[PDB]
Structure 1
Amino acid sequence: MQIFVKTLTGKTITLEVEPSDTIENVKAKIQDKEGIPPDQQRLIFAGKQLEDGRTLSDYNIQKESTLHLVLRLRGG
């Protein structure tokens, strides 16, 4: 299964993941593509926020899906 991740800048990156893959795993993959910390990245599906501890299957995401990227702002 493959999914497309778009960002607020207007950029799109293809990503290959399975329904059992966790969001946290996806965060690390994004860090490799962008070079941005995974904590500072937010993934949304159908305009709904996504939890790192939750899996793709939890949000009922099938093949060919679009996810939007947002930036987390925290002082750690």
Structure 2
Amino acid sequence: MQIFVKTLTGKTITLEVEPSDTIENVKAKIQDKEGIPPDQQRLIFAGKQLEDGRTLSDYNIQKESTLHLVLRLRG
């Protein structure tokens, strides 16, 4: 239903989700609401990276769960 993200700065905004949605849509909402481009995001939930193919509910996404956002950098 609704989930939180712990941004790198520290602020925790709230964004709407779907019962089972692709990570691409979530990254699109993050980039349209916070700024970081989708290819520069690494979302971690319960110590497991969220692949671009697997749906949210596979990694046990549910109501009132906190995620984290980490910047992607290349050498």
Asked whether the two chains share a fold, i.e. TM above 0.5, the reply is: yes
Displacement of 1:6 after TM fit? 0.8
Describe the superposition over 1:4-32 as per-residue Cα deviations: whole angstroms up to 9, x where unpaired.
01122211110110121111110010001
Report the CA distance shift for 1:35/1:8 in structure 2 as closer, same or farther (over 3 A): closer
Unmatched 5+ stretches in structure 2: none
TM-score, normalization by structure 1: 0.88
Describe the superposition over 1:50-71 as per-residue Cα deviations: whole angstroms up to 9, x where unpaired.
1111111110122111100001
Runs of 4 or more, structure 1, over 3 Å off, are none
Displacement of 1:40 after TM fit? 0.3
Q: Which residue of 1 aligns with 2:2?
A: 2
Contact in 2 for aligned 1:19/1:55 (Cα 8 Å): no
RMSD: 1.6
TM-score, normalization by structure 2: 0.89
Q: State the identity as a percent.
A: 100
Structure 1: how far apart are the matches of 2:13 and 2:35? 13
Contact in 2 for aligned 1:43/1:69 (Cα 8 Å): yes
Structure 1: how far apart are the matches of 2:3 and 2:24? 16
